[PDB]
C-alpha cells in the first residue's frame, strides 16, 4: 500500500519544516498543502500536513534527513487508491 | 484502525458536499480542512478532503445519506496513530 506519515505541533513551527522538503524533493512521492481538524469550535494554531513515500524504507531516510522536533508527533498507516 | 474516505473532483463541487455533512453531524468523527496536493507545478481546481468515520458500518451509512457523483472517485483506507 502507499505509506502516509502525518505530523503536527505549532502551525509555525510547521513553516520551517516544508523548507527543509525542499531540498529533499528526491525523498517523498506527493506533499499535501498545510491543513488541518476544522469544526465549529476550535482551539488554536494547529496546521497539520502529510507526505507520501513509494516505500516504507524510503520513508525511515526522509526521517533521517529532518530532525522532527520532540513537540512534532509522527503517525504511520497506509491507503488504498 | 481508523476508516478514512478520500473524495476528489472540482473544487466548487466539493463546496455543496460540506453543506450535506451539516445535518449529517452525527455520522463522521473528524472532518478535514480542504486540501490538495500542492507542487511547484499544479493543473486546475481539484482541491480535496477527508472524512474519518469510528467504524466500517457507519461509513455505509454517511455514503447513503450522500450522493456520491459519478465524476467525483472514493477511496478506502486505514491510518495508525
Not at 45 to 54: F, M, N, R
Not at 71 to 78: A, L, M
Request: charged share 20%.
Amino acid at each position: 500500500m502507499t505509506p502516509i506519515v502525518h505530523l503536527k505541533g505549532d502551525a509555525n513551527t510547521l513553516k520551517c519544516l516544508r523548507y527543509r522538503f525542499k531540498k529533499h524533493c528526491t525523498l517523498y512521492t506527493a506533499v499535501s498543502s498545510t491543513w488541518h481538524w476544522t469544526g465549529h469550535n476550535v482551539k488554536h494554531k494547529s496546521a497539520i500536513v502529510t507526505l507520501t513515500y513509494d516505500s516504507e524504507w524510503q520513508r525511515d531516510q526522509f526521517l533521517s534527513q529532518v530532525k522532527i522536533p520532540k513537540t512534532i508527533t509522527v503517525s504511520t498507516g497506509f491507503m488504498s487508491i
